[PDB]
Amino acid sequence: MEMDIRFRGDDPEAYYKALREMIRQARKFAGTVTVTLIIRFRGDDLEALEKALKEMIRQARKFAGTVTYTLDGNDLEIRITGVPPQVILELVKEAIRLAKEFNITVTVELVIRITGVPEQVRKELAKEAERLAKEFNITVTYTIRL
């Protein structure tokens, strides 16, 4: 009685707005939407990475959630939990922005943990996940439990 959705290496506005609408629909529908966000930064400019950490910590710590991280030399991992789903989309836009500003390499991943929803919702979101994967040519997967 649960559906997860996993997205990675996201594309420009057309995709973000579309995704947002799926995000929106899901929240409305009679269920619990638990979202988790992961980003990994890479680059030799360690000073840049340390600030990219600090901006995302401060912004995302203003939500009723928490933040964890690790630095495997020149690879910084960030795991954000507890954030409202309609904002999540915008924290994605901010972490891409930091990739450009500091001229560093960044990857992004969204985990949506939907609990107790209709099979009509599951099939539509599936079709929307099937659709977006193909139009934008990116990493898209999902899981359903019963």
Numbering used by the authors: 1 to 146
From the paper:
Here, we explore the viability of such a mechanism by inserting one de novo designed alpha beta protein into another such that the two beta sheets are combined into one. The backbone geometry at the junctions between the original domains is regularized, and the sequence at the newly formed interface is optimized to stabilize the single integrated domain structure. Crystal structures of two such proteins demonstrate that complex beta sheet structures can be designed with considerable accuracy using this approach and provide a proof-of-concept for the hypothesis that complex beta topologies in natural proteins may have evolved from simpler beta sheet structures in a similar manner. Our success in designing larger beta sheet domains by recombining smaller independently folded beta sheet proteins suggests a similar mechanism could have played a role in the evolution of naturally occurring complex beta sheet proteins.
A second extended sheet protein was created by inserting one designed ferredoxin domain into another to create a half-barrel structure with four alpha helices and six beta strands. A beta turn segment between two beta strands of the host ferredoxin was removed and the resulting cut-points in the host beta strands were linked to two beta strand cut-points in the insert, fusing the two strand pairs into a single, longer pair at the center of a six-stranded beta sheet. CD spectra show that the protein contains both alpha and beta structures. Crystals were obtained which diffracted to 3.3Å resolution. Attempts to improve these statistics by rebuilding portions of the model proved unsuccessful, possibly due to a register shift or dynamic fluctuations in the structure (perhaps corresponding to slightly 'molten-globule'-like behavior) that are difficult to computationally model. However, unbiased low-resolution omit maps suggest that the overall topology is correct. In the model that displays the best refinement statistics, the protein backbone was similar to the design model with a C-alpha RMSD value of 2 Å. The fused beta sheet aligns with the design model, while the inter-domain helices shift slightly to accommodate the inter-domain interface. The most similar SCOP domains had weak TM-align scores (0.54 and 0.51), and the sheets in these matched structures have different connectivities than those of the designs, suggesting that the two designed proteins have novel folds.
